[PDB]
Amino acid sequence: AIPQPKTYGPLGNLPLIDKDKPTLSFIKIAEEYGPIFQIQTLSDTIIVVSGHELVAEVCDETRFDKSIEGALAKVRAFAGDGLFTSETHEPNWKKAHNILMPTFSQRAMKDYHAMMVDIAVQLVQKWARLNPNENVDVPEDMTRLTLDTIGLCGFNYRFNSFYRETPHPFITSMTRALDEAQHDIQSMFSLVDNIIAERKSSGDQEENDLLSRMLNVPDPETGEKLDDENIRFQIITFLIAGHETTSGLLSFAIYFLLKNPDKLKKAYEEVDRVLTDPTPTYQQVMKLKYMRMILNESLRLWPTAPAFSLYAKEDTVIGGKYPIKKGEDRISVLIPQLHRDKDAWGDNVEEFQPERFEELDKVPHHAYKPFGNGQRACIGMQFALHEATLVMGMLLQHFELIDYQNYQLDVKQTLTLKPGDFKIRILPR
Ligand code: HEM
Ligand SMILES: CCCCCCCCCCCCCCCC(=O)O
């Protein structure tokens, strides 16, 4: 039987978790009960898997599929049947997957690079125009950048987050729809439908982005284009799935570089050697290999999307001993503990060492899952890593980052993980 922490009659296992800190709570219980355990709530049971062998076993696509059972079922209210919140067997999933997969390749990022630079320059100019001793809020400015980059690169819409003191009506409306996990959802649907209507009427200009892609390219298997409602769901899906996770990545990367001076010094080395022009080029961004290893290490230590869920396709066993009823038990992957599995990663799991990714043969894959698994893995992986590398390189090109308050990490979790109350100061170089 699957290990279980305790039980308190009607209360299940909930007396052992902080409802506001689910991932961290599960980390604690994992430290107590090992690579697999089950948590009983008032209504259901969750199986939390964290050992790399069991995680790899549950990652077998023949036996397990993506589950949308809990948080994602709430996100579904406004994300609908988009890539993030649709079941694999639903038709629009593989339709949109085939349609949009080439646009998210690394070669396709060559097409988005300019727009990414646009928003990056905005961030840099903001920080350069600060008055002496003004503080910057790393998560909020990173979120400004990530939301604007996704809007511009994806459907050529400028949120202009850097022209606002309070985050955009869309992002607070989205936070209200998520803190539910109707007014707001309808306003979101209409804004997206407005951009879609602007594009379908007089769609002359070669915008060459995600919306034009969904309007032009059909699914080669079915021969069909995505319908309008699903395109709306896809645009909302890109916004939610991209901006928060990628801004969390940027914030954690800035934190780790501030707390590990050697890695920052090496990053300065690489950026100065590569970033010679005022604005980076796509080729130059790819040359920033050490920065991308810094990002890989940051995602290992604090995966901004800390979990994904699976369901069993037919009755089976894990580890040779733990049974799973078919399609009834929701398996949650505890990505931080998986990323701290010493048998797969070694002993220095808590150290910030980008050099773990120095040699692409040595990285223990299937114990490194910051972007999900298999066919339901993150379609925006290359988008996110390219954008994050660009922003980090540019910030290091222009700025000296100062830990003026001696920041003490506090991992806040909403739907994603991020540093809470993270403020620094900046100087020009
Ligand atoms: C650091 C940045 C990011 C992280 C850590 C991340 C993480 C993830 C994870 C873990 C999943 C799998 C979720 C599950 O299987 O339940 C996923 C899926 C997805 N992500 Fe990302 N993501 C990031 C950036 C982005 C960006 C930039 C975009 C879009 C521009 C995006 C769009 C999506 C979509 C559409 C899916 C659904 C994939 C499918 O099953 O078809 N993500 N992401
Ligand atoms: C930063 C560390 C976070 C760790 C989260 C562990 C907190 C939960 C420990 C057991 C529950 C104790 C109180 C939680 C609230 C409650 O019981 O109503």
Question: Which amino acid is it at 292?
Answer: R
Instruction: Give the number of the atom of ligand 1 that is nearest the alpha carbon of residue 83.
Output: 41
Helices (H) and strands (E) in the chain, counts: 16, 12
162-179: burial string, b at 16+ Cβ within 10 Å, e else: eeeeebbebbebbeebbe
Q: Report the 10 Å Cβ neighbour count for 57.
A: 18
Query: Taking Cα atoms as reference points, which of 78, 74, 58 lies closest to residue 66?
Result: 58
Q: How far apart are CA 27 and CA 7, in angstroms?
A: 18
Catalytic site residue from 59, 146, 378, 383: 378
381-387-388 Cα angle (round to 5): 90
Could you give the count of Cα atoms lying within 13 Å of 405 in the half-sphere of its Cβ?
14
Q: To one decimal place, what's the resolution in Å?
A: 2.8
Q: Is 153 a catalytic residue?
A: no
The answer to whether 334 and 48 are in contact (CB under 8 A) is yes
| Ligand 2 pocket by Cβ (under 6 Å) | 15-18, 21, 24-25, 28
Instruction: For residue 371, give Cα distances in angstroms to 295, 296, 368.
Output: 13, 11, 9
Q: Is 238 a catalytic residue?
A: no
Q: Is 399 a catalytic residue?
A: no
The answer to whether 418 and 247 are in contact (CB under 8 A) is yes
Q: How was this structure determined?
A: X-ray
Q: DSSP assignment, residue 59?
A: T
